[model samples]
Target: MWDERFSQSEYVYGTEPNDFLVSVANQIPQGKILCLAEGEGRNACFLASLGYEVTAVDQSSVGLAKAKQLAQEKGVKITTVQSNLADFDIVADAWEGIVSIFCHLPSSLRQQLYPKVYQGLKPGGVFILEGFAPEQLQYNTGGPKDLDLLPKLETLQSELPSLNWLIANNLERNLDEGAYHQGKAALIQLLGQKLEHHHHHH
Candidate 1:
Protein backbone atom coordinates (compact mmCIF):
# COMPACT_ATOMS: atom_id res chain seq x y z
CA MET A 1 0.00 0.00 0.00
CA TRP A 2 2.78 2.44 0.89
CA ASP A 3 4.75 1.62 -2.26
CA GLU A 4 1.58 2.27 -4.22
CA ARG A 5 0.89 5.52 -2.37
CA PHE A 6 4.35 6.82 -3.09
CA SER A 7 4.35 5.50 -6.64
CA GLN A 8 2.82 8.77 -7.82
CA SER A 9 5.17 11.44 -9.11
CA GLU A 10 4.07 14.00 -6.57
CA TYR A 11 4.78 13.79 -2.88
CA VAL A 12 1.40 12.71 -1.59
CA TYR A 13 1.87 14.25 1.84
CA GLY A 14 3.74 17.31 0.53
CA THR A 15 7.34 18.45 0.55
CA GLU A 16 7.08 20.89 3.43
CA PRO A 17 7.50 19.72 6.97
CA ASN A 18 4.58 19.20 9.28
CA ASP A 19 3.49 22.45 10.93
CA PHE A 20 3.20 21.01 14.44
CA LEU A 21 6.67 19.46 14.14
CA VAL A 22 8.23 22.71 12.98
CA SER A 23 6.42 24.62 15.71
CA VAL A 24 7.83 22.47 18.53
CA ALA A 25 11.21 21.56 17.03
CA ASN A 26 13.33 23.95 19.05
CA GLN A 27 12.99 21.80 22.13
CA ILE A 28 14.63 18.74 20.60
CA PRO A 29 18.23 18.14 21.63
CA GLN A 30 20.75 17.80 18.84
CA GLY A 31 21.82 14.24 17.93
CA LYS A 32 20.82 11.33 15.75
CA ILE A 33 17.10 11.14 14.95
CA LEU A 34 15.01 8.32 13.58
CA CYS A 35 11.86 8.96 11.56
CA LEU A 36 9.45 6.04 11.46
CA ALA A 37 7.52 5.33 8.29
CA GLU A 38 8.96 8.54 6.93
CA GLY A 39 7.01 8.88 3.71
CA GLU A 40 8.77 11.02 1.08
CA GLY A 41 11.11 12.46 3.74
CA ARG A 42 9.72 15.98 4.24
CA ASN A 43 10.06 15.90 8.02
CA ALA A 44 13.40 14.09 7.91
CA CYS A 45 14.72 16.46 5.29
CA PHE A 46 13.48 19.40 7.28
CA LEU A 47 15.28 18.16 10.37
CA ALA A 48 18.43 17.47 8.39
CA SER A 49 18.26 21.04 7.13
CA LEU A 50 18.15 22.07 10.77
CA GLY A 51 21.34 20.04 11.43
CA TYR A 52 19.85 16.94 12.98
CA GLU A 53 21.51 13.70 11.86
CA VAL A 54 18.45 11.99 10.48
CA THR A 55 17.66 8.46 9.37
CA ALA A 56 14.37 7.95 7.58
CA VAL A 57 12.85 4.47 7.73
CA ASP A 58 10.02 3.27 5.58
CA GLN A 59 8.70 0.08 4.11
CA SER A 60 8.53 1.70 0.70
CA SER A 61 11.67 2.06 -1.38
CA VAL A 62 9.83 4.45 -3.65
CA GLY A 63 9.08 6.75 -0.73
CA LEU A 64 12.68 6.64 0.45
CA ALA A 65 13.86 7.55 -3.04
CA LYS A 66 11.70 10.63 -2.96
CA ALA A 67 12.99 11.40 0.50
CA LYS A 68 16.57 11.18 -0.72
CA GLN A 69 15.73 13.43 -3.63
CA LEU A 70 13.96 15.87 -1.35
CA ALA A 71 16.95 15.97 0.98
CA GLN A 72 19.34 16.64 -1.88
CA GLU A 73 17.16 19.40 -3.30
CA LYS A 74 17.17 21.04 0.11
CA GLY A 75 21.00 20.75 0.17
CA VAL A 76 20.98 18.32 3.06
CA LYS A 77 21.60 14.59 3.44
CA ILE A 78 19.53 12.03 5.34
CA THR A 79 20.01 8.29 5.50
CA THR A 80 17.09 6.21 4.32
CA VAL A 81 16.39 2.69 5.56
CA GLN A 82 13.90 0.40 3.93
CA SER A 83 12.01 -1.40 6.68
CA ASN A 84 8.62 -2.08 8.10
CA LEU A 85 7.66 -0.24 11.29
CA ALA A 86 5.94 -3.27 12.73
CA ASP A 87 9.24 -5.13 12.66
CA PHE A 88 11.64 -2.20 13.04
CA ASP A 89 13.67 -1.37 16.13
CA ILE A 90 16.39 1.15 16.72
CA VAL A 91 19.39 -0.05 18.70
CA ALA A 92 18.92 0.11 22.46
CA ASP A 93 19.41 3.68 23.75
CA ALA A 94 20.64 4.65 20.31
CA TRP A 95 18.67 7.72 19.37
CA GLU A 96 18.52 11.21 20.78
CA GLY A 97 15.15 11.72 19.18
CA ILE A 98 12.47 10.02 17.07
CA VAL A 99 9.51 11.18 15.04
CA SER A 100 6.36 9.74 13.50
CA ILE A 101 4.02 12.01 11.62
CA PHE A 102 0.69 10.82 10.32
CA CYS A 103 2.05 7.28 10.41
CA HIS A 104 -0.87 5.27 11.64
CA LEU A 105 -0.86 1.50 11.90
CA PRO A 106 -2.96 -1.43 13.00
CA SER A 107 -3.70 -1.29 16.76
CA SER A 108 -1.71 -4.43 17.49
CA LEU A 109 1.35 -3.16 15.66
CA ARG A 110 1.14 0.27 17.26
CA GLN A 111 0.84 -1.40 20.63
CA GLN A 112 3.87 -3.52 19.84
CA LEU A 113 5.94 -0.51 18.86
CA TYR A 114 5.07 1.70 21.82
CA PRO A 115 7.13 -0.45 24.18
CA LYS A 116 10.08 -0.47 21.81
CA VAL A 117 9.98 3.31 21.67
CA TYR A 118 10.75 3.44 25.38
CA GLN A 119 13.60 0.98 24.98
CA GLY A 120 15.22 2.65 21.99
CA LEU A 121 15.72 6.18 23.29
CA LYS A 122 18.69 7.34 25.31
CA PRO A 123 17.98 8.94 28.67
CA GLY A 124 16.48 12.36 28.00
CA GLY A 125 15.79 11.36 24.40
CA VAL A 126 12.43 12.35 23.02
CA PHE A 127 9.74 10.83 20.84
CA ILE A 128 7.69 13.27 18.79
CA LEU A 129 4.52 12.57 16.83
CA GLU A 130 1.19 13.55 15.35
CA GLY A 131 -1.30 10.77 14.65
CA PHE A 132 -4.93 10.51 13.73
CA ALA A 133 -7.55 10.11 16.39
CA PRO A 134 -10.72 8.15 15.67
CA GLU A 135 -12.59 11.42 15.40
CA GLN A 136 -10.65 12.28 12.24
CA LEU A 137 -12.76 9.84 10.26
CA GLN A 138 -15.72 12.15 10.76
CA TYR A 139 -13.83 14.94 8.98
CA ASN A 140 -13.18 13.32 5.59
CA THR A 141 -9.53 14.24 5.82
CA GLY A 142 -6.43 12.07 5.79
CA GLY A 143 -5.95 8.89 7.89
CA PRO A 144 -7.52 5.46 8.04
CA LYS A 145 -11.21 5.02 8.67
CA ASP A 146 -10.72 1.80 10.57
CA LEU A 147 -10.91 2.31 14.34
CA ASP A 148 -7.80 0.14 14.85
CA LEU A 149 -5.59 2.51 12.89
CA LEU A 150 -6.84 5.56 14.77
CA PRO A 151 -5.11 5.41 18.12
CA LYS A 152 -6.27 7.39 21.13
CA LEU A 153 -4.84 8.78 24.39
CA GLU A 154 -5.88 5.67 26.21
CA THR A 155 -3.68 3.61 23.91
CA LEU A 156 -0.71 5.87 24.54
CA GLN A 157 -1.21 5.76 28.29
CA SER A 158 -1.43 2.03 28.17
CA GLU A 159 1.42 1.29 25.73
CA LEU A 160 4.14 3.74 26.62
CA PRO A 161 5.99 3.40 29.89
CA SER A 162 7.60 6.06 32.14
CA LEU A 163 8.44 9.30 30.37
CA ASN A 164 8.05 13.02 30.75
CA TRP A 165 5.08 14.24 28.76
CA LEU A 166 6.36 17.39 27.15
CA ILE A 167 3.28 17.47 24.97
CA ALA A 168 0.37 15.07 25.25
CA ASN A 169 -2.64 16.48 23.55
CA ASN A 170 -5.72 15.61 21.50
CA LEU A 171 -7.30 18.47 19.61
CA GLU A 172 -8.86 19.74 16.39
CA ARG A 173 -6.77 21.89 14.10
CA ASN A 174 -6.83 23.09 10.51
CA LEU A 175 -4.67 20.97 8.24
CA ASP A 176 -2.61 22.33 5.36
CA GLU A 177 0.18 19.82 4.79
CA GLY A 178 -0.78 19.05 1.21
CA ALA A 179 -3.42 17.79 -1.20
CA TYR A 180 -3.93 14.77 1.02
CA HIS A 181 -4.34 16.20 4.51
CA GLN A 182 -6.63 19.20 4.19
CA GLY A 183 -9.22 20.98 6.30
CA LYS A 184 -9.80 20.76 10.05
CA ALA A 185 -9.25 17.40 11.66
CA ALA A 186 -8.86 15.71 15.01
CA LEU A 187 -5.51 14.23 15.99
CA ILE A 188 -3.14 13.52 18.87
CA GLN A 189 0.23 15.19 19.20
CA LEU A 190 2.84 13.84 21.60
CA LEU A 191 6.37 14.71 22.68
CA GLY A 192 7.63 12.35 25.34
CA GLN A 193 11.12 12.29 26.77
CA LYS A 194 12.86 9.19 28.00
CA LEU A 195 13.64 10.13 31.56
CA GLU A 196 15.90 8.63 34.18
CA HIS A 197 14.33 5.63 35.90
CA HIS A 198 10.50 6.48 35.50
CA HIS A 199 7.50 8.96 34.70
CA HIS A 200 3.99 10.24 32.97
CA HIS A 201 0.95 12.93 32.84
CA HIS A 202 -0.90 16.25 31.99
Candidate 2:
Protein backbone atom coordinates (compact mmCIF):
# COMPACT_ATOMS: atom_id res chain seq x y z
CA MET A 1 0.00 0.00 0.00
CA TRP A 2 2.78 2.41 0.93
CA ASP A 3 4.76 1.55 -2.17
CA GLU A 4 1.88 2.41 -4.39
CA ARG A 5 1.28 5.54 -2.38
CA PHE A 6 4.86 6.74 -2.72
CA SER A 7 5.40 5.89 -6.34
CA GLN A 8 3.92 9.23 -7.33
CA SER A 9 6.23 11.83 -8.86
CA GLU A 10 5.61 14.37 -6.14
CA TYR A 11 6.43 13.78 -2.49
CA VAL A 12 3.17 12.96 -0.76
CA TYR A 13 4.21 14.32 2.62
CA GLY A 14 6.05 17.34 1.26
CA THR A 15 9.80 17.92 1.59
CA GLU A 16 9.86 19.80 4.87
CA PRO A 17 10.58 18.07 8.14
CA ASN A 18 7.86 17.82 10.76
CA ASP A 19 7.37 21.15 12.50
CA PHE A 20 7.75 19.63 15.98
CA LEU A 21 10.98 17.94 14.99
CA VAL A 22 12.36 21.16 13.51
CA SER A 23 11.84 22.85 16.89
CA VAL A 24 13.50 20.13 19.02
CA ALA A 25 16.13 18.84 16.62
CA ASN A 26 18.84 20.90 18.29
CA GLN A 27 18.46 18.79 21.42
CA ILE A 28 19.44 15.56 19.69
CA PRO A 29 23.06 14.53 20.27
CA GLN A 30 25.31 14.68 17.22
CA GLY A 31 26.09 11.24 15.79
CA LYS A 32 24.38 8.40 14.02
CA ILE A 33 20.59 8.74 13.95
CA LEU A 34 17.90 6.29 12.97
CA CYS A 35 14.56 7.29 11.45
CA LEU A 36 11.81 4.71 11.72
CA ALA A 37 9.10 4.30 9.10
CA GLU A 38 10.78 7.20 7.38
CA GLY A 39 8.68 7.35 4.24
CA GLU A 40 9.99 9.60 1.45
CA GLY A 41 12.97 10.71 3.63
CA ARG A 42 12.03 14.32 4.31
CA ASN A 43 13.15 14.15 7.94
CA ALA A 44 16.24 12.12 7.20
CA CYS A 45 17.37 14.47 4.47
CA PHE A 46 16.72 17.46 6.68
CA LEU A 47 18.82 15.96 9.48
CA ALA A 48 21.55 14.99 7.10
CA SER A 49 21.65 18.58 5.89
CA LEU A 50 22.20 19.51 9.53
CA GLY A 51 25.32 17.28 9.71
CA TYR A 52 23.83 14.27 11.48
CA GLU A 53 24.66 10.89 9.99
CA VAL A 54 21.17 9.70 9.16
CA THR A 55 19.75 6.37 8.13
CA ALA A 56 16.13 6.18 6.94
CA VAL A 57 14.20 2.95 7.36
CA ASP A 58 10.91 2.29 5.60
CA GLN A 59 8.86 -0.63 4.38
CA SER A 60 8.60 0.69 0.85
CA SER A 61 11.51 0.62 -1.57
CA VAL A 62 9.73 3.11 -3.82
CA GLY A 63 9.58 5.58 -0.98
CA LEU A 64 13.23 5.03 -0.18
CA ALA A 65 14.17 5.58 -3.81
CA LYS A 66 12.39 8.90 -3.74
CA ALA A 67 14.12 9.72 -0.47
CA LYS A 68 17.48 9.16 -2.09
CA GLN A 69 16.42 11.36 -4.97
CA LEU A 70 15.40 14.08 -2.57
CA ALA A 71 18.69 13.78 -0.73
CA GLN A 72 20.49 14.24 -3.99
CA GLU A 73 18.33 17.19 -4.92
CA LYS A 74 19.19 18.80 -1.60
CA GLY A 75 22.88 18.01 -2.02
CA VAL A 76 22.82 16.05 1.23
CA LYS A 77 23.66 12.42 1.96
CA ILE A 78 21.55 9.84 3.77
CA THR A 79 21.33 6.07 3.93
CA THR A 80 18.07 4.35 3.09
CA VAL A 81 17.05 0.93 4.32
CA GLN A 82 13.96 -0.87 3.06
CA SER A 83 12.55 -3.27 5.62
CA ASN A 84 9.33 -3.81 7.48
CA LEU A 85 9.41 -2.45 11.02
CA ALA A 86 8.65 -5.90 12.40
CA ASP A 87 11.88 -7.24 10.90
CA PHE A 88 14.02 -4.11 11.16
CA ASP A 89 16.73 -4.33 13.79
CA ILE A 90 17.07 -1.35 16.07
CA VAL A 91 20.63 -2.06 17.11
CA ALA A 92 21.18 -1.50 20.82
CA ASP A 93 23.30 1.44 21.93
CA ALA A 94 24.10 2.27 18.35
CA TRP A 95 22.28 5.50 17.67
CA GLU A 96 22.63 8.99 19.04
CA GLY A 97 18.97 9.59 18.26
CA ILE A 98 15.84 7.98 16.84
CA VAL A 99 12.91 9.64 15.17
CA SER A 100 9.29 8.70 14.56
CA ILE A 101 7.13 11.20 12.68
CA PHE A 102 3.58 10.17 12.03
CA CYS A 103 4.57 6.55 11.78
CA HIS A 104 1.37 4.81 12.77
CA LEU A 105 1.12 1.09 13.34
CA PRO A 106 -1.14 -1.39 15.03
CA SER A 107 -1.15 -1.52 18.84
CA SER A 108 0.52 -4.91 18.94
CA LEU A 109 3.33 -3.84 16.61
CA ARG A 110 3.86 -0.58 18.44
CA GLN A 111 4.09 -2.38 21.77
CA GLN A 112 6.84 -4.60 20.41
CA LEU A 113 8.73 -1.84 18.59
CA TYR A 114 8.86 0.69 21.44
CA PRO A 115 11.11 -1.48 23.60
CA LYS A 116 13.63 -1.37 20.80
CA VAL A 117 13.17 2.38 20.59
CA TYR A 118 14.27 2.65 24.24
CA GLN A 119 17.18 0.27 23.73
CA GLY A 120 18.38 1.63 20.39
CA LEU A 121 19.57 4.91 21.80
CA LYS A 122 22.98 5.50 23.31
CA PRO A 123 23.17 7.28 26.64
CA GLY A 124 22.17 10.91 26.11
CA GLY A 125 20.44 9.97 22.89
CA VAL A 126 17.15 11.64 22.05
CA PHE A 127 13.89 10.35 20.65
CA ILE A 128 11.58 12.68 18.79
CA LEU A 129 7.98 11.92 17.85
CA GLU A 130 4.85 13.53 16.47
CA GLY A 131 1.64 11.68 15.73
CA PHE A 132 -2.10 12.05 15.69
CA ALA A 133 -3.91 11.79 18.99
CA PRO A 134 -7.14 9.87 19.55
CA GLU A 135 -9.13 13.02 19.18
CA GLN A 136 -7.84 13.33 15.64
CA LEU A 137 -10.53 10.89 14.60
CA GLN A 138 -13.00 13.73 14.80
CA TYR A 139 -11.03 15.64 12.21
CA ASN A 140 -10.70 14.58 8.59
CA THR A 141 -7.52 16.55 7.97
CA GLY A 142 -5.16 13.56 8.03
CA GLY A 143 -3.84 10.41 9.73
CA PRO A 144 -5.24 6.94 10.10
CA LYS A 145 -8.96 6.74 10.73
CA ASP A 146 -8.63 3.93 13.24
CA LEU A 147 -8.62 4.85 16.94
CA ASP A 148 -6.17 2.08 17.74
CA LEU A 149 -3.58 3.47 15.35
CA LEU A 150 -3.42 6.84 17.08
CA PRO A 151 -0.95 7.29 19.95
CA LYS A 152 -1.78 8.79 23.29
CA LEU A 153 0.65 10.61 25.59
CA GLU A 154 -0.05 8.27 28.50
CA THR A 155 0.59 5.15 26.48
CA LEU A 156 3.81 6.59 25.06
CA GLN A 157 5.01 7.55 28.52
CA SER A 158 4.41 4.04 29.74
CA GLU A 159 6.08 2.50 26.73
CA LEU A 160 9.27 4.48 27.19
CA PRO A 161 9.67 4.75 30.93
CA SER A 162 13.46 4.48 30.82
CA LEU A 163 13.87 7.79 29.05
CA ASN A 164 13.65 11.22 30.64
CA TRP A 165 11.00 13.22 28.85
CA LEU A 166 12.15 16.68 27.90
CA ILE A 167 8.88 17.70 26.37
CA ALA A 168 5.54 15.93 26.20
CA ASN A 169 2.29 17.42 25.17
CA ASN A 170 -1.04 16.74 23.52
CA LEU A 171 -1.97 19.68 21.38
CA GLU A 172 -4.56 20.94 18.96
CA ARG A 173 -2.62 22.58 16.18
CA ASN A 174 -2.94 23.43 12.52
CA LEU A 175 -0.90 21.28 10.13
CA ASP A 176 0.25 22.12 6.60
CA GLU A 177 2.09 18.95 5.73
CA GLY A 178 1.47 18.70 2.00
CA ALA A 179 -1.59 17.14 0.39
CA TYR A 180 -2.45 14.60 3.08
CA HIS A 181 -2.04 16.57 6.30
CA GLN A 182 -3.73 19.91 6.40
CA GLY A 183 -5.97 22.07 8.60
CA LYS A 184 -6.52 21.82 12.38
CA ALA A 185 -5.29 18.55 13.82
CA ALA A 186 -5.07 16.87 17.18
CA LEU A 187 -1.52 15.81 17.78
CA ILE A 188 0.91 14.45 20.34
CA GLN A 189 4.52 15.59 20.34
CA LEU A 190 7.31 14.34 22.57
CA LEU A 191 11.03 14.62 23.05
CA GLY A 192 12.69 12.06 25.31
CA GLN A 193 16.36 11.64 26.12
CA LYS A 194 18.27 8.73 27.60
CA LEU A 195 20.20 9.86 30.66
CA GLU A 196 23.83 9.13 31.04
CA HIS A 197 24.92 6.88 33.87
CA HIS A 198 26.10 8.48 37.10
CA HIS A 199 29.67 7.73 38.13
CA HIS A 200 30.41 6.45 41.66
CA HIS A 201 32.35 8.95 43.76
CA HIS A 202 33.98 6.22 45.81
Candidate 3:
Protein backbone atom coordinates (compact mmCIF):
# COMPACT_ATOMS: atom_id res chain seq x y z
CA MET A 1 0.00 0.00 0.00
CA TRP A 2 2.75 2.43 0.96
CA ASP A 3 4.95 1.35 -1.92
CA GLU A 4 2.20 2.19 -4.35
CA ARG A 5 1.71 5.58 -2.74
CA PHE A 6 5.42 6.35 -2.75
CA SER A 7 5.93 5.31 -6.37
CA GLN A 8 5.43 8.80 -7.65
CA SER A 9 7.47 11.55 -9.24
CA GLU A 10 6.96 14.03 -6.44
CA TYR A 11 7.63 13.24 -2.79
CA VAL A 12 4.32 12.49 -1.13
CA TYR A 13 5.33 14.12 2.13
CA GLY A 14 7.38 16.89 0.54
CA THR A 15 11.17 17.30 0.70
CA GLU A 16 11.38 19.37 3.88
CA PRO A 17 11.92 17.88 7.31
CA ASN A 18 9.04 18.00 9.76
CA ASP A 19 8.69 21.39 11.48
CA PHE A 20 8.74 20.05 15.03
CA LEU A 21 11.82 17.97 14.26
CA VAL A 22 13.69 20.96 12.87
CA SER A 23 12.83 22.93 16.00
CA VAL A 24 14.33 20.30 18.32
CA ALA A 25 17.00 18.87 16.03
CA ASN A 26 19.73 20.53 18.06
CA GLN A 27 18.71 18.61 21.17
CA ILE A 28 19.42 15.19 19.63
CA PRO A 29 22.94 14.04 20.40
CA GLN A 30 25.25 13.86 17.42
CA GLY A 31 25.63 10.15 16.75
CA LYS A 32 23.82 7.15 15.41
CA ILE A 33 20.11 7.96 15.04
CA LEU A 34 17.25 5.69 14.13
CA CYS A 35 14.23 7.08 12.25
CA LEU A 36 11.25 4.80 12.32
CA ALA A 37 8.69 4.67 9.49
CA GLU A 38 10.59 7.39 7.76
CA GLY A 39 8.70 7.62 4.51
CA GLU A 40 10.65 9.14 1.58
CA GLY A 41 13.50 10.22 3.92
CA ARG A 42 12.78 13.90 4.50
CA ASN A 43 13.64 13.73 8.21
CA ALA A 44 16.52 11.26 7.81
CA CYS A 45 18.12 13.24 5.01
CA PHE A 46 17.80 16.40 7.08
CA LEU A 47 19.56 14.72 10.02
CA ALA A 48 22.25 13.37 7.69
CA SER A 49 22.90 16.90 6.48
CA LEU A 50 23.44 17.82 10.14
CA GLY A 51 26.24 15.17 10.28
CA TYR A 52 24.31 12.62 12.28
CA GLU A 53 24.76 8.99 11.26
CA VAL A 54 21.15 8.33 10.29
CA THR A 55 19.37 5.09 9.51
CA ALA A 56 15.79 5.27 8.16
CA VAL A 57 13.54 2.26 8.41
CA ASP A 58 10.35 1.85 6.41
CA GLN A 59 8.29 -0.99 4.98
CA SER A 60 8.24 0.32 1.41
CA SER A 61 10.93 -0.38 -1.17
CA VAL A 62 9.81 2.52 -3.32
CA GLY A 63 9.80 4.81 -0.32
CA LEU A 64 13.34 3.85 0.64
CA ALA A 65 14.43 4.28 -2.96
CA LYS A 66 13.01 7.79 -2.99
CA ALA A 67 14.74 8.37 0.35
CA LYS A 68 18.04 7.40 -1.22
CA GLN A 69 17.33 9.67 -4.16
CA LEU A 70 16.53 12.54 -1.82
CA ALA A 71 19.73 11.85 0.11
CA GLN A 72 21.67 11.99 -3.14
CA GLU A 73 20.02 15.24 -4.12
CA LYS A 74 20.78 16.73 -0.71
CA GLY A 75 24.43 15.57 -0.95
CA VAL A 76 23.98 13.60 2.25
CA LYS A 77 24.30 9.94 3.14
CA ILE A 78 21.74 7.90 5.08
CA THR A 79 21.16 4.18 5.56
CA THR A 80 17.76 2.80 4.62
CA VAL A 81 16.26 -0.39 5.97
CA GLN A 82 13.27 -2.01 4.28
CA SER A 83 11.21 -3.84 6.86
CA ASN A 84 7.96 -3.55 8.75
CA LEU A 85 8.26 -1.93 12.17
CA ALA A 86 6.94 -5.15 13.63
CA ASP A 87 9.81 -7.18 12.19
CA PHE A 88 12.54 -4.64 12.68
CA ASP A 89 14.40 -5.15 15.92
CA ILE A 90 15.59 -2.11 17.85
CA VAL A 91 19.12 -2.78 19.10
CA ALA A 92 19.31 -1.97 22.80
CA ASP A 93 21.35 1.03 23.89
CA ALA A 94 22.84 1.46 20.42
CA TRP A 95 21.31 4.66 19.15
CA GLU A 96 22.13 8.17 20.32
CA GLY A 97 18.62 9.21 19.32
CA ILE A 98 15.41 7.75 17.92
CA VAL A 99 12.71 9.59 15.98
CA SER A 100 9.19 8.97 14.84
CA ILE A 101 7.23 11.50 12.80
CA PHE A 102 3.63 10.76 11.89
CA CYS A 103 4.43 7.10 12.23
CA HIS A 104 1.05 5.75 13.24
CA LEU A 105 0.64 2.07 14.00
CA PRO A 106 -2.07 -0.21 15.30
CA SER A 107 -2.46 -0.13 19.06
CA SER A 108 -1.29 -3.73 19.35
CA LEU A 109 1.87 -3.03 17.37
CA ARG A 110 2.47 0.20 19.26
CA GLN A 111 2.17 -1.57 22.58
CA GLN A 112 4.78 -4.06 21.43
CA LEU A 113 7.17 -1.58 19.79
CA TYR A 114 7.28 1.38 22.23
CA PRO A 115 9.14 -0.61 24.89
CA LYS A 116 11.81 -1.38 22.33
CA VAL A 117 11.83 2.31 21.34
CA TYR A 118 12.66 3.18 24.94
CA GLN A 119 15.41 0.54 25.19
CA GLY A 120 16.97 1.35 21.83
CA LEU A 121 18.38 4.69 22.95
CA LYS A 122 21.66 5.31 24.73
CA PRO A 123 21.82 7.10 28.06
CA GLY A 124 20.78 10.75 27.74
CA GLY A 125 19.53 10.02 24.23
CA VAL A 126 16.54 11.92 22.92
CA PHE A 127 13.36 10.57 21.40
CA ILE A 128 11.33 12.83 19.13
CA LEU A 129 7.81 12.25 17.95
CA GLU A 130 4.94 13.98 16.13
CA GLY A 131 1.68 12.34 15.27
CA PHE A 132 -1.91 13.24 14.55
CA ALA A 133 -4.21 13.28 17.55
CA PRO A 134 -7.64 11.65 17.63
CA GLU A 135 -9.16 15.09 17.27
CA GLN A 136 -7.53 15.31 13.85
CA LEU A 137 -10.34 13.16 12.53
CA GLN A 138 -12.62 16.16 12.81
CA TYR A 139 -10.38 18.28 10.61
CA ASN A 140 -9.85 15.43 8.15
CA THR A 141 -6.51 16.87 7.10
CA GLY A 142 -4.51 13.62 7.34
CA GLY A 143 -3.89 10.41 9.29
CA PRO A 144 -6.03 7.37 9.90
CA LYS A 145 -9.66 7.71 10.78
CA ASP A 146 -9.43 4.94 13.32
CA LEU A 147 -9.28 6.34 16.82
CA ASP A 148 -7.13 3.45 18.03
CA LEU A 149 -4.39 4.43 15.59
CA LEU A 150 -4.41 8.02 16.84
CA PRO A 151 -2.92 7.87 20.31
CA LYS A 152 -3.57 10.47 22.97
CA LEU A 153 -0.70 12.27 24.73
CA GLU A 154 -1.63 10.60 28.00
CA THR A 155 -1.32 7.18 26.39
CA LEU A 156 2.22 7.91 25.24
CA GLN A 157 3.14 9.32 28.66
CA SER A 158 2.07 6.05 30.22
CA GLU A 159 3.76 3.99 27.53
CA LEU A 160 7.15 5.61 28.00
CA PRO A 161 7.35 6.37 31.70
CA SER A 162 11.12 6.00 32.09
CA LEU A 163 11.93 8.90 29.80
CA ASN A 164 12.23 12.44 31.12
CA TRP A 165 9.89 14.51 29.04
CA LEU A 166 11.53 17.71 27.95
CA ILE A 167 8.64 18.75 25.76
CA ALA A 168 5.19 17.21 25.39
CA ASN A 169 1.97 18.68 24.19
CA ASN A 170 -1.22 18.16 22.27
CA LEU A 171 -2.06 21.15 20.18
CA GLU A 172 -3.62 22.54 17.02
CA ARG A 173 -1.54 23.62 14.06
CA ASN A 174 -1.67 24.37 10.36
CA LEU A 175 0.13 21.50 8.63
CA ASP A 176 1.49 22.09 5.17
CA GLU A 177 3.28 18.98 4.10
CA GLY A 178 2.14 17.88 0.66
CA ALA A 179 -1.04 17.24 -1.27
CA TYR A 180 -2.22 14.65 1.19
CA HIS A 181 -1.26 16.36 4.43
CA GLN A 182 -2.41 19.98 4.52
CA GLY A 183 -4.55 22.43 6.48
CA LYS A 184 -5.52 22.68 10.15
CA ALA A 185 -4.62 19.64 12.23
CA ALA A 186 -4.56 18.31 15.74
CA LEU A 187 -1.22 16.84 16.78
CA ILE A 188 0.71 15.36 19.64
CA GLN A 189 4.36 16.40 19.76
CA LEU A 190 6.97 15.17 22.21
CA LEU A 191 10.64 15.14 23.08
CA GLY A 192 11.78 12.68 25.70
CA GLN A 193 15.24 11.91 27.05
CA LYS A 194 16.60 8.67 28.38
CA LEU A 195 18.20 9.39 31.74
CA GLU A 196 21.34 7.55 32.83
CA HIS A 197 19.89 6.67 36.23
CA HIS A 198 16.78 4.89 34.99
CA HIS A 199 17.32 1.21 34.26
CA HIS A 200 14.96 -0.88 32.20
CA HIS A 201 13.05 -3.49 34.13
CA HIS A 202 12.84 -7.05 32.89
- Residue-wise C-alpha lDDT for candidate 3, range 1-202, written one tens digit per residue: 4554545575333336566566556776667777777444677778777767777787777767777787888777778777666667456355556666555677767877777666654444556666566567666655454777765667777877777677788767777766665566777777776564556567
Measured on C-alpha atoms, candidate 3 has an lDDT of 0.67
Candidate 1 has an lDDT of: 0.66
Best by TM-score: 2
> Mind giving the per-residue lDDT tens digits that candidate 1 earns over 121-195?
445445666667666666655545566666566766566656556778886778776665556777777777655
Q: Total backbone clashes of model 2?
A: 0
lDDT of 2 by residue, 115-154 (tens): 7666654455566666676667766655565787776777
**Model 3: which ten-residue window has the lowest total lDDT?**
6-15
Comparing 1 with 2 on lDDT, the higher-scoring candidate is 2
- Report, for every candidate in turn, its global Cα lDDT versus the true structure: 0.66, 0.67, 0.67
Instruction: Please identify which of the two predictions, 1 or 3, would achieve the higher TM-score against the true structure.
Output: 3
Q: How displaced is residue 79 in candidate 1, in Å? A: 0.9
TM-score of each: 0.72, 0.74, 0.73
Off by over 4 Å in 3: 1-19, 94-96, 175-184, 196-202
